[PDB]
Amino acid sequence: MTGAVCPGSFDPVTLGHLDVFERAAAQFDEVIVAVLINAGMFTVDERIEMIRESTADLPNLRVESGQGLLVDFVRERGLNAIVKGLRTGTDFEYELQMAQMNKHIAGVDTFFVATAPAYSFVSSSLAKEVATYGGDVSALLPASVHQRLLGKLR
Amino acid sequence: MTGAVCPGSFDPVTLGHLDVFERAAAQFDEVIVAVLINAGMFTVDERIEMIRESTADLPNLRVESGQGLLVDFVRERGLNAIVKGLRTGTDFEYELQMAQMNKHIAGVDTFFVATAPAYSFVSSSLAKEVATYGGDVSALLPASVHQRLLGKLR
Amino acid sequence: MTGAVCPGSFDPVTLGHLDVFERAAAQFDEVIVAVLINPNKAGMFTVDERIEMIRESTADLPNLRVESGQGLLVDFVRERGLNAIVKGLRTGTDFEYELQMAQMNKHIAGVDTFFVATAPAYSFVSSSLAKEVATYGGDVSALLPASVHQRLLGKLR
Amino acid sequence: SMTGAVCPGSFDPVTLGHLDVFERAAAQFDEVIVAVLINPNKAGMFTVDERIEMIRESTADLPNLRVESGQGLLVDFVRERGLNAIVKGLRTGTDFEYELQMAQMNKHIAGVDTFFVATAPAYSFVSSSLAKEVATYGGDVSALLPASVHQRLLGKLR
Amino acid sequence: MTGAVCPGSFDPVTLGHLDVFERAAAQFDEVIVAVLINPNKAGMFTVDERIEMIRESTADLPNLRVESGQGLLVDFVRERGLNAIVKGLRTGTDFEYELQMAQMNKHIAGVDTFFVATAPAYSFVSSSLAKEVATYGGDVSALLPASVHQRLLGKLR
Amino acid sequence: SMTGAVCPGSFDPVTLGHLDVFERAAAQFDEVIVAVLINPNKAGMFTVDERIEMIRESTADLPNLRVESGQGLLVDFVRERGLNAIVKGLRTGTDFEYELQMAQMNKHIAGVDTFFVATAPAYSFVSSSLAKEVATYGGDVSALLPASVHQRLLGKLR
Ligand SMILES: O=C(O)Cc1ccc2ccccc2c1
Ligand SMILES: O=C(O)Cc1ccc2ccccc2c1
Ligand SMILES: O=C(O)Cc1ccc2ccccc2c1
Ligand SMILES: O=C(O)Cc1ccc2ccccc2c1
C-alpha cells in the first residue's frame, strides 16, 4: 500500500509537472496531486480540472485541493512521502530546507526527481509571462491547458 | 509490486547510507542495495556483510553485488527506479547528468532523498581518512562497521 | 581587544542563531548582536521583545551584548570601534548572495566578514520557516530556545 | 555591419559592471544594441531618458554601440532588428541557473541565442540594486559607477 | 572580421558540442575548433580521427575550421589573430570552474570567453559518459553524430 | 596573546589570495599560525623550507603571524597549540559545500570552529594549481603571486 503526494499551485499545470506525475504514478501504488489554495490566474477548480484532464491515463492518481501544512495534508491521507520535481542545484538547496523541516515535524519523507531535459526551462510563471506577450508555449503545456490559457488572456 | 535499487560502493557503509536505505524500505515494497565491484579498503564480501548486519530490521531489503551499467542491474531485477541520497546542490548537478542519462538509455527513474541533517558531513572517504589519523568516527558508523574499521587499520 | 558584530532581524532568534553567537563569543573578545529596526516591514515581535529573547538565550555569554540599530550595517560596526561581521551560513546559495554583500561592505568601509557553517542539527531552521510551521500547529520547540517557544505560542493565540 | 548582439537590462542605473560587458560585446560583434527595458507598470529610479543619457555618456568611445529602449519580449526586440544574439554578464553559478532558464526559453520561442560573459573581478559585487541601497544609507559607491551616474544618483536620493 | 575559438578534446565530438559549434558559427565571421593534443593521457581516438569526425559533422558550416594544438589556449587564440573563446555550459558548477579559467585567460592575455547554454536535449551528454555507456552496450546513438556512432562501435570491438 | 586562529593550506606556492586571507586573520585575532601541510607521500613543487620562506618573506609586516608545518589531522595541529579556530578563504558556493563538510567533521571530532572569508575580488581566480599550470606553459602570473614566489616558480619550471 505505497503512496506519494505531489504538491504545487499548478497555475497552470505544465508538461514538466505532468512528467513528474507520470513518474510518481509509475513507482507508487497511489498518487495524490495536492493543489494549494492560497493572486493567481486560474481558480482552484480550474486548476484541478486541468490536471484531471491531463492525467486521465493514470488510473492510480487523484487530484485534491488543500491548505495549511503540506505534511498534515499528507498524513491525513495515510501517507508519508512527497514527490517533487527539480531543475537545478539552486532548487535542491531551498527545497532541501523544507524537506528536512517536514521530516522533522511529521516524519514525512521527500523524494526529488530530475526534470525531463525537454522541460528543464518551463515553469507556470514563465509560460504565463511568455504567452501574455504573444510567445508560442503550445509545446510546453498539455493541449487542454494551452487552449484554456489562450482564453484567459483573450 | 513496487521497488527501488540503492547503489554505491559502501566502503564502508555509513549511518548516512543506512538512513537512506531505511527511508527507501519504508516507501517501496522491495529494496535492493547494489554494491559495486570495481582500490578499496574492504572486499565486496565484507561490504555486503556489513550492510546485511546493519539492515537486519529491514525485512524487505536485500543486498547484492554487481558491475557494468547500473541500469542493467536494475532492469534485470524487474525494477526501474534508483534511490540515491544527496547532501548538496553540487551533488544534485552531477547526479542529475547521470539520472538523465539512465532515463534516456533504459527508462530507469532516479529518486533523490535529502540527507538526514546529523549525517550531512559523513562520507565513507572522510570517515576512513579521519579514522586513519586517530579521529573518533564511532557516532557516524553502525557499531558493527566501526569495530571492523578499527581492525583494518590496526 | 578583538571584536565582531552578528547582525540580523532575529524575529525570533533560533537555535541556529544561538549557535553562531556562541561560536563568535568563543573566538572574539567582544561580540555585539545587532538587531535591525525596520520602519517598513514590522515583523512578529517588537525590537524590545527580540532583544529580550536574545538576552535570555545568551545569559551565559558575558562578552556578548545585544543592541539595536538601523541603516548601513558597516556604520553600526565602525561606530563601535569594530571592523568585523560574523554571520552563519547554511548553503552554497547562501554563500553567493552573502558574498556580494561582504565584498561590498569591505569595499565601502573596510569591514571584514567571517562566515561560519551552522551546526548540522539547525541547518534547516530559520525564523521565517519556524513561524510558518508554528502558525499551523507544527512543533518547532526543538529548534528554538525554550523561552522563545513560550513567547511564540502566546503571540499565536 | 553583419554580426550583432543585444545587451539587455533595466540599467537603473548602469554600473561599471554593465559597461565592462558592453565594451567586451562591442569588441566582438560588428554592432551592439544596448536594450533598456522599461516596465510600463513600475517606474524605476531614473526615467528612460535619464537611463539612456547615462549609458551614452559612458559609451562615447564605442563607435559601434547604440542605445534603445523597449518593453515586452526581449526576443521581439532582437528579431525586429534582424539580430538573433543576446549578450549578458554573469557573476555566479546561481546567476547562471536562472538565466539558463530564460536563455533556453528564448531559444525555444524565437531561435535567439544567448552568450554569457564573466564580469571583471573588480565588479563582481556591484549591481544596480545594491548600489542604490548602499547609496540610500550613505555608503560610498563612487568607484562602482561611471561618472555619468554617481552624482545623478545622489541627486535622486536627496 | 570577427571570430572565436571553440576548444576541447572532443574524444569523441558529441551532439552537445555540435550544437555549440553551430551557434558560434552563426554569430561570428570565423570559428576555429581547437582540438587538444595531450602527450600524457591518450584517449580513445587519435587527434586525426577526432578532427575527421568534427569535419564530417560540421560539413555545412563553411566559416568553421578544425585545427589541433597544445599548450596554453590563449596562445593558440592570439596566434590566429583572435581574442575570443566560445564554450558550452551545462550547470552552475560548470560556470564556477570555467569562470576561474575565463578570468585567468582574460588577465594573462586579454582573451574573452563567451559561454552558451547547451540545448536541453544534450544537457546530459558528455564524451566521457557516452564512451562509458557505450562500452557496456548502452545505446548512445541519439546523442552523437551518425558517423561518430559508427566509429565508436568499431573501436569497441 | 589570547585569541588565535590557524590558516591552513599546502601553499605550494603561496598566492596573493592567501596573503590577503592571512592579513585579514591577523587583523582580527591576537595570533595567527599559518599551517603548511606536507604530504609525506607526495612532494609538491616546493620543499617545506621553500614554502615557509616564501610565506615569511611576504608576511614580514604582520608581527602577530607565524608559520609552521605539519601533517595528519588539522584539528590536532590546532588543539596542540591551545587554539580552536581555523580561518579559510573561499571563492565560490562550490568552495563552500565541500569545505562545509570538512568544517562540520572538524567540529564533530575536535570542537574546532571554522571561519570562512570571501577572497578579495582581484584574486578570485588565482589558485596555486592554476598559477603553476599557467606558468608551466608560459603565461604571465606575476601579478598574482608575491615577489617572494614568482621568480622562484619560474626557476622550478626551468
Ligand atoms: O509546498 C508547500 O509546502 C506548500 C503547500 C503546497 C500545496 C499544498 C496542498 C495542499 C495542502 C497544503 C499544501 C501546502
Ligand atoms: O553508480 C553507478 O552508476 C555505478 C554503479 C554503482 C553500483 C553498481 C552496482 C551493481 C551494478 C552496477 C553498479 C554501477
Ligand atoms: O545585514 C544588513 O546589512 C542589514 C542590517 C542588519 C542589522 C543591522 C543592525 C543594526 C544596524 C544596521 C543593520 C543592518
Ligand atoms: O581549454 C584549455 O585551456 C586547454 C586547451 C584545450 C584545447 C587546446 C587546443 C589547442 C591549443 C591549446 C588548447 C588548450
PDB file of N, CA and C and ligand atoms in Angstrom, chain A residues 7-8 34-36 65-70 73 84 98, ligand 1:
ATOM      1  N   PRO A   7       2.895  17.967  -4.633  1.00  0.00           N
ATOM      2  CA  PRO A   7       2.295  19.253  -4.285  1.00  0.00           C
ATOM      3  C   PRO A   7       2.632  20.381  -5.241  1.00  0.00           C
ATOM      4  N   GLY A   8       1.774  21.397  -5.272  1.00  0.00           N
ATOM      5  CA  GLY A   8       2.058  22.598  -6.038  1.00  0.00           C
ATOM      6  C   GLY A   8       0.871  23.525  -6.121  1.00  0.00           C
ATOM      7  N   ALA A  34      -1.634  17.400  -4.896  1.00  0.00           N
ATOM      8  CA  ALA A  34      -2.137  18.340  -3.902  1.00  0.00           C
ATOM      9  C   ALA A  34      -2.048  19.768  -4.415  1.00  0.00           C
ATOM     10  N   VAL A  35      -3.205  20.375  -4.628  1.00  0.00           N
ATOM     11  CA  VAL A  35      -3.295  21.697  -5.213  1.00  0.00           C
ATOM     12  C   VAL A  35      -3.508  22.738  -4.134  1.00  0.00           C
ATOM     13  N   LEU A  36      -2.565  23.654  -4.011  1.00  0.00           N
ATOM     14  CA  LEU A  36      -2.620  24.641  -2.954  1.00  0.00           C
ATOM     15  C   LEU A  36      -3.729  25.665  -3.166  1.00  0.00           C
ATOM     16  N   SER A  65      -7.491  19.422  -3.440  1.00  0.00           N
ATOM     17  CA  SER A  65      -7.019  20.725  -3.004  1.00  0.00           C
ATOM     18  C   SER A  65      -6.833  20.759  -1.494  1.00  0.00           C
ATOM     19  N   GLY A  66      -6.058  21.721  -1.010  1.00  0.00           N
ATOM     20  CA  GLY A  66      -5.898  21.900   0.419  1.00  0.00           C
ATOM     21  C   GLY A  66      -5.102  23.140   0.754  1.00  0.00           C
ATOM     22  N   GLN A  67      -4.941  23.392   2.048  1.00  0.00           N
ATOM     23  CA  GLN A  67      -4.111  24.490   2.517  1.00  0.00           C
ATOM     24  C   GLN A  67      -3.527  24.149   3.881  1.00  0.00           C
ATOM     25  N   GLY A  68      -2.750  25.070   4.438  1.00  0.00           N
ATOM     26  CA  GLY A  68      -2.055  24.809   5.685  1.00  0.00           C
ATOM     27  C   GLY A  68      -0.760  24.054   5.439  1.00  0.00           C
ATOM     28  N   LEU A  69      -0.350  23.235   6.400  1.00  0.00           N
ATOM     29  CA  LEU A  69       0.894  22.479   6.257  1.00  0.00           C
ATOM     30  C   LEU A  69       0.727  21.305   5.312  1.00  0.00           C
ATOM     31  N   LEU A  70       1.616  21.207   4.329  1.00  0.00           N
ATOM     32  CA  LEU A  70       1.604  20.068   3.425  1.00  0.00           C
ATOM     33  C   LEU A  70       1.697  18.740   4.191  1.00  0.00           C
ATOM     34  N   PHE A  73      -1.663  17.526   5.228  1.00  0.00           N
ATOM     35  CA  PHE A  73      -2.383  17.005   4.081  1.00  0.00           C
ATOM     36  C   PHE A  73      -1.935  15.578   3.776  1.00  0.00           C
ATOM     37  N   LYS A  84       8.635  15.517  -5.555  1.00  0.00           N
ATOM     38  CA  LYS A  84       8.745  16.864  -6.108  1.00  0.00           C
ATOM     39  C   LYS A  84       9.747  16.869  -7.249  1.00  0.00           C
ATOM     40  N   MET A  98      13.138  22.697   3.301  1.00  0.00           N
ATOM     41  CA  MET A  98      11.754  22.297   3.516  1.00  0.00           C
ATOM     42  C   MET A  98      11.608  20.809   3.774  1.00  0.00           C
TER      43      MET A  98
HETATM   44  O1  LIG G   1       4.582  23.241  -0.961  1.00  0.00           O
HETATM   45  C1  LIG G   1       4.261  23.566   0.215  1.00  0.00           C
HETATM   46  O2  LIG G   1       4.951  23.184   1.194  1.00  0.00           O
HETATM   47  C2  LIG G   1       3.030  24.409   0.443  1.00  0.00           C
HETATM   48  C3  LIG G   1       1.802  23.616   0.072  1.00  0.00           C
HETATM   49  C4  LIG G   1       1.572  23.298  -1.262  1.00  0.00           C
HETATM   50  C5  LIG G   1       0.452  22.566  -1.617  1.00  0.00           C
HETATM   51  C6  LIG G   1      -0.454  22.152  -0.627  1.00  0.00           C
HETATM   52  C7  LIG G   1      -1.590  21.413  -0.985  1.00  0.00           C
HETATM   53  C8  LIG G   1      -2.483  21.001  -0.006  1.00  0.00           C
HETATM   54  C9  LIG G   1      -2.254  21.322   1.328  1.00  0.00           C
HETATM   55  C10 LIG G   1      -1.125  22.049   1.686  1.00  0.00           C
HETATM   56  C11 LIG G   1      -0.223  22.466   0.691  1.00  0.00           C
HETATM   57  C12 LIG G   1       0.914  23.204   1.055  1.00  0.00           C
END
